Amino acid sequence: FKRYVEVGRVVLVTKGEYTGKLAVIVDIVDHKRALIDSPCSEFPRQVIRYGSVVLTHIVMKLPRGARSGIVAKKWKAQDVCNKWASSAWAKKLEAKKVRSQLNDFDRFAVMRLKKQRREQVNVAV
Amino acid sequence: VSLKKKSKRRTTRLRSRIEKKAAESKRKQKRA
Amino acid sequence: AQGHRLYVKAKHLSFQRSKHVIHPGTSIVKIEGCDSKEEAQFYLGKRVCYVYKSSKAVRGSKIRVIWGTIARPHGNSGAVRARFVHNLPAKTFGSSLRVMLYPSNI
Amino acid sequence: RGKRVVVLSQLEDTLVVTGPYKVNGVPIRRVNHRYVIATSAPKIDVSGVSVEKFTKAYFAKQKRSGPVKKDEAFFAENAPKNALPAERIADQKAVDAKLLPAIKAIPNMKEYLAASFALSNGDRPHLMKF
Amino acid sequence: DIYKDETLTIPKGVTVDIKARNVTVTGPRGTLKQNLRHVDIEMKKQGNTIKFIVWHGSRKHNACIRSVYSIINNMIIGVTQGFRYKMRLVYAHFPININLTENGTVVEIRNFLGERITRVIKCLPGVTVSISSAVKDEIILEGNSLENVSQSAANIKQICNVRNKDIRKFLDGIYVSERGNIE
Amino acid sequence: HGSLGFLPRKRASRQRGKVKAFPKDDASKPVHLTAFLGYKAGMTHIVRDLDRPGSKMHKREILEAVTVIETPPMVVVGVVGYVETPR
Amino acid sequence: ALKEYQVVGRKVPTEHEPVPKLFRMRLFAPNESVAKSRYWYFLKMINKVKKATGEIVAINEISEPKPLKAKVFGIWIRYDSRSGTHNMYKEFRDTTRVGAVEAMYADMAARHRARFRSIRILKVVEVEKKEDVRRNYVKQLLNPHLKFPLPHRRTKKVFAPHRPSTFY
Amino acid sequence: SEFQKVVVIDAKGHLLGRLASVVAKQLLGGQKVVVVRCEELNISGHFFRNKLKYLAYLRKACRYNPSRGAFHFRAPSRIFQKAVRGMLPHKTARGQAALEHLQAVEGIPPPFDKQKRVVVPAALRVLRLKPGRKYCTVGRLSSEVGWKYNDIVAKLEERRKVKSAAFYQAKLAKQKKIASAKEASPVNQKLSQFGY
RNA sequence: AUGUAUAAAAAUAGAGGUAGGCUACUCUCCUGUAUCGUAGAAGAUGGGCGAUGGUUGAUGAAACGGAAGUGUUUUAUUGACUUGUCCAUGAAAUUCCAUGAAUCCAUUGCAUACGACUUUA
RNA sequence: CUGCCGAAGUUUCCGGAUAGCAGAAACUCAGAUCAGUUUUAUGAGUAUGUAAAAUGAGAGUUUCUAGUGGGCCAUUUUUGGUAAGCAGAACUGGCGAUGCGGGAUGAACCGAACGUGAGGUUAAGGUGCCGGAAUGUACGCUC
């Protein structure tokens, strides 16, 4: 295996108003609930269910039950921000996010862009 | 299909007498 | 051929009904791409048309249309209730409908 | 339908709109606001084009007061070539002349109005943000 | 229990790969491939240790961990020392004639209880049958799979069965005498 | 009534008895046919030595009624190939 | 959604008892109306105090002082069964006393099919020391190196094109 | 979400009733559904239980012309079609038109082996059954109750998998060439701001 | 019908690779909200610039597809179009939604209540 | 043909009268009386009977004239019991004169009581498919 529910593991929220936000499991409440925290102020420390988050491959060295300030300090020290972005998974999510807030004029420019991209179809025989 | 030897769902007359059987049990306990 | 279809594709599911009583005045329409009552709110008040073909050439054309309007969402799955000028025939269950983008409010 | 147009002014009920006739060939027209999709495309100047001449009576059709219509010479009449006075092409050409430098300065504006909008597979209008 | 695990130390055995739960244990004596799809257990391989892990399993499923452990250990023993079963013929009056064909994978038994029917048994794959000269009326079944060897012994014993006779007085039959390893 | 294995009890749709099952094909055996078509002429009776070991009438003469069918050689006029399908 | 309610009440003052004893209970209920009803039920069954003769002097919801601190709560209850007389003790690990009671009610109705009215919570305590924990599943939670793969994952848009990963 | 005029569903790894329930509703919605590999369908419950269920179904017969009794079909596609048919108003002209839009087959015949095959997550066994729960395969259930074409379907499927794999390697090799030449065009990085 | 656009296989307590020598690498997965395709009087008329490709129509083919192969390629031409990048004309008053045999008649009797069946002509 | 009003469904005396329920006619009554109701008080044995505030409604009589005088089902108390059924009362309910939603189907079950319609929202029951509506959310149990 590569994803284990352990203290300090980074998770991505999939259900709820915090969908798409990154968090770190500060404690294991039980088999079905865990306490998470995030350095972002808009994300408050809260108890969430595992069914609402996906376990990411990133694990940070964080002591059990660390407060919000300690979690943020550990998060900055271990640069989990841009460590998650280094993965192609994050790039796809951001590329998906950028695309969805595109508008009609941008979509028009994209088709011209990708058709200029496609006009080559030049491969050595 | 069901693998049972009897229809698990009974007849309306059969369930009606079961409420009568429940009536008998009340008679056995309360008065009889 | 990708320069048209300013409409959204829909299907005539059934009529607004209970288990045994049908109300043909209003129909249930599943707009594809719409998957919740919140998304159905966008299509409320849009113009839905049922397009069919006939043998007689009325107005020199064999294509006839029945107009209608989406009224309200139906259930949690994103289906809506539509009222047509002529109540849709019961033979059109599962047939294709066309949801216009007007009256626009975007 | 599907043509992308530049809004000149808001009338009492409709919008006086016209695509640059040298781009998409859409004359000056009243269009009801319920048949319009407002896009987040960059705004084109309109202060340089005079719009007071665009009135409801100016766009109004001559009254008939009778059910009479429908003739071959009647359809041979009207037509884009004639039955419209030269001032109508005149003011529009003034509009395009005032409008073209604005659309030319900002890139992709001419091709965008040349193209016609249409829905494709996997397009959901309620989720797309024009 | 959240976590129930069993740990096994693998021997000089070459490969103990568990790809798709299929254990292709290759050893100096030979190779056996077996399937473990019947059990939902994690086989984690690390160096010389193999862990069978079950998370949040019930008692019924947790019972499979040791059973999976035993069959893995048994087959590993097979690829390293192997299994040899010594079966001794038991007769009172009629000699039991046993013939070995294609290096013993088929055993033909004749003259049992004076019967004229030739009882032919084909052994399971990986099992070879030999007649040891050290002890008379002695059959040796050596192979890699303890399952195959013991099943072969069971089939031979069940074929030579006494029917309608007093087993108290009729002692005729073939029975397994020793169950051990080749080395 | 008789055996229900024959309960359709109806006229045969065919004048010629159709073969319904052919012997299983084997690649090891070289190529050979498996059926022939004849015409029933009649029967007679014959005397044949009974070489049946263990029988009460071993090494003895028996009278057997035997049907005679005329079988002029057939002409192979064509060939048909059959493909196995899930149907 | 249950709520913890402090309900203090006493019988109406009279000449015989001008200063009636004030009795307080910490009891859980979806709303204040249910809590005051449950309080009256317990008071009648213990002190024989009639509802008409009594009155509710204070009702206050009690929030969790440390809702962000994982705890272990032990609950003593009087289980009502076929025989209608049973005592049980259970331990639940969570961050709120209300959550533990909610888990207690769900568990009992699940395992023993006991309704809200049949169940009466006798006492709820917070077991802070790991040693007093009596439950093996709870103890396995308090182990220092707790780590396990996520179980029961399982994951309109019908007709998916590819097969689900249902893994990492 | 969205429909297709014709939908090919790979029934391998699915559940009989869950797939049938989804398919029956889709047929009523006016869609045409083709179900391939009906011999690979799964049913919750161990084989012997499901075998006994089928034997009980076979037991239904009359004393007057068993031809008047229920016709019991052993093919896995016919078993699936029976499940779908009981979920449709088949005595009604609407349900009859729904049935004619269903085509359940064993294996993947040529007209569909070159077409995309979608799956139904609401019916996939891995997403619906707790691990360690006994289940049976309709192909094994069919072959043990009278179906006599299990081997022919198996052999034909192995050949199709070989041909499909060869097509994939050619497609994969082609995709690598376009993948390599993709970054050659500078525009992909010039205006990658749009998320493409 | 309104793009009637998309063919690996298997696993889910794992797969797929790349790069290596059934074993040592690291990377990817976490569904398609993807990829392909998409500007043009239903799509007009010419002119450049830059590819030297793409999309096809009609011929000529050879290889492939048998499970229901009725389709896959490779092409040799020919006729078009090309938006890859720029230009110049045209558009409208539709001046606010509507779209050769068989049969009967005969013949046979291997058949038969009557039809049917097998023959012959 | 349409409309309006609309029972009784049984006491009490010898098949009839009386009364009850329904109307009509003619009166007096609104600083008045009523009530399938609840309080308060008195006593007496949580109930009882008697009297005197709350709430509601205009409240009263006289004549005379129709129809009705069954049953079935269920709850509770109680009287006995008997292999076990049940048998005997009382009690007010439901049906009966009454369609409609649900319970797969139904004299007695759950809702609900009816002019013709449009819209909205619910009861009971439901939301995999048949079948309108979550292959919803969360926690367990079961092979």
UniProtKB/Swiss-Prot annotation, chain A:
Function: Component of the ribosome, a large ribonucleoprotein complex responsible for the synthesis of proteins in the cell. The small ribosomal subunit (SSU) binds messenger RNAs (mRNAs) and translates the encoded message by selecting cognate aminoacyl-transfer RNA (tRNA) molecules. The large subunit (LSU) contains the ribosomal catalytic site termed the peptidyl transferase center (PTC), which catalyzes the formation of peptide bonds, thereby polymerizing the amino acids delivered by tRNAs into a polypeptide chain.
Highest taxon of source: Eukaryota
Family: Belongs to the eukaryotic ribosomal protein eL14 family.
Keyword Mitochondrion listed: no
Name of the featured protein: Large ribosomal subunit protein eL14
Organismal lineage: Eukaryota, Fungi, Dikarya, Ascomycota, Taphrinomycotina
Keyword Ligase: no
Chief location: cytoplasm
GO MF terms held by the record: RNA binding; structural constituent of ribosome
GO cellular component annotations of the record: cytosol; cytosolic large ribosomal subunit; nucleus; preribosome
Native organism: Schizosaccharomyces pombe (strain 972 / ATCC 24843)
Subunit structure of this chain's protein: Component of the large ribosomal subunit (LSU). Mature yeast ribosomes consist of a small (40S) and a large (60S) subunit. The 40S small subunit contains 1 molecule of ribosomal RNA (18S rRNA) and at least 33 different proteins. The large 60S subunit contains 3 rRNA molecules (25S, 5.8S and 5S rRNA) and at least 46 different proteins.
Example GO biological process: cytoplasmic translation
Gene coding for it: rpl14
Places the protein is found: Cytoplasm; Nucleus
UniProtKB/Swiss-Prot annotation, chain B:
Bias-annotated ranges (Basic and acidic residues): 16-26
The protein's role, per its UniProt record: Required for optimal growth. Required for normal processing of ribosomal pre-rRNA. Required for nuclear export of ribosomal protein rpl2501.
Record-stated family: Belongs to the TRAFAC class YlqF/YawG GTPase family.
Transmembrane segments: none
Written domain comment of the UniProt record: In contrast to other GTP-binding proteins, this family is characterized by a circular permutation of the GTPase motifs described by a G4-G1-G3 pattern.
UniProt name for this protein: GTPase grn1
Ranges of Basic residues composition bias in the record: 1-15
Disruption phenotype annotation: 20-40% of cells exhibit morphogenetic aberrations represented by irregular, uneven, or overdeposition of septum material as well as septation and cell separation defects, often resulting in pseudofilamentous or multiseptated cells, suggesting a failure of cytokinesis in those cells. Cultures of null mutant cells did not appear to exhibit a growth arrest.
Subcellular localization(s) per the UniProt record: Nucleus, Nucleolus
Lineage: Eukaryota, Fungi, Dikarya, Ascomycota, Taphrinomycotina
Gene: grn1
UniProtKB/Swiss-Prot annotation, chain D:
Keyword Phosphoprotein applies: yes
GO cellular component: a single term: preribosome
Residues bearing PTM Phosphoserine: S40, S50
The UniProt record lists the keyword 4Fe-4S: no
Gene Ontology molecular function: RNA binding; structural constituent of ribosome
Quaternary data: Component of the large ribosomal subunit (LSU). Mature yeast ribosomes consist of a small (40S) and a large (60S) subunit. The 40S small subunit contains 1 molecule of ribosomal RNA (18S rRNA) and at least 33 different proteins. The large 60S subunit contains 3 rRNA molecules (25S, 5.8S and 5S rRNA) and at least 46 different proteins.
Family note: Belongs to the eukaryotic ribosomal protein eL6 family.
The protein's role, per its UniProt record: Component of the ribosome, a large ribonucleoprotein complex responsible for the synthesis of proteins in the cell. The small ribosomal subunit (SSU) binds messenger RNAs (mRNAs) and translates the encoded message by selecting cognate aminoacyl-transfer RNA (tRNA) molecules. The large subunit (LSU) contains the ribosomal catalytic site termed the peptidyl transferase center (PTC), which catalyzes the formation of peptide bonds, thereby polymerizing the amino acids delivered by tRNAs into a polypeptide chain.
The name this protein goes by in its record: Large ribosomal subunit protein eL6
Residues of the full protein shown: 66 to 195 of 195
Curated annotation (Swiss-Prot), chain H:
Keywords: Cytoplasm, Phosphoprotein, Ribonucleoprotein, Ribosomal protein
Localization per record: Cytoplasm
Modified residues (Phosphoserine): S192
Entry keyword Transmembrane: no
Predominant subcellular localization, coarse grouping: cytoplasm
Single biological process term from Gene Ontology: cytoplasmic translation
Example of a GO MF term: mRNA binding
Listed GO CC annotations: cytosol; cytosolic large ribosomal subunit; preribosome; ribosome
Stored CDD domains: Ribosomal_L13
SS bond partners: none
Record's function text: Component of the ribosome, a large ribonucleoprotein complex responsible for the synthesis of proteins in the cell. The small ribosomal subunit (SSU) binds messenger RNAs (mRNAs) and translates the encoded message by selecting cognate aminoacyl-transfer RNA (tRNA) molecules. The large subunit (LSU) contains the ribosomal catalytic site termed the peptidyl transferase center (PTC), which catalyzes the formation of peptide bonds, thereby polymerizing the amino acids delivered by tRNAs into a polypeptide chain.
Family under the similarity heading: Belongs to the universal ribosomal protein uL13 family.
UniProt-listed NCBIfam families: L13_A_E
Miscellaneous note of the record: There are 3 genes for uL13 in S.pombe.
HAMAP family assigned: Ribosomal_uL13
Subunit structure: Component of the large ribosomal subunit (LSU). Mature yeast ribosomes consist of a small (40S) and a large (60S) subunit. The 40S small subunit contains 1 molecule of ribosomal RNA (18S rRNA) and at least 33 different proteins. The large 60S subunit contains 3 rRNA molecules (25S, 5.8S and 5S rRNA) and at least 46 different proteins.
Record's protein name: Large ribosomal subunit protein uL13B
Gene name per UniProt: rpl1601
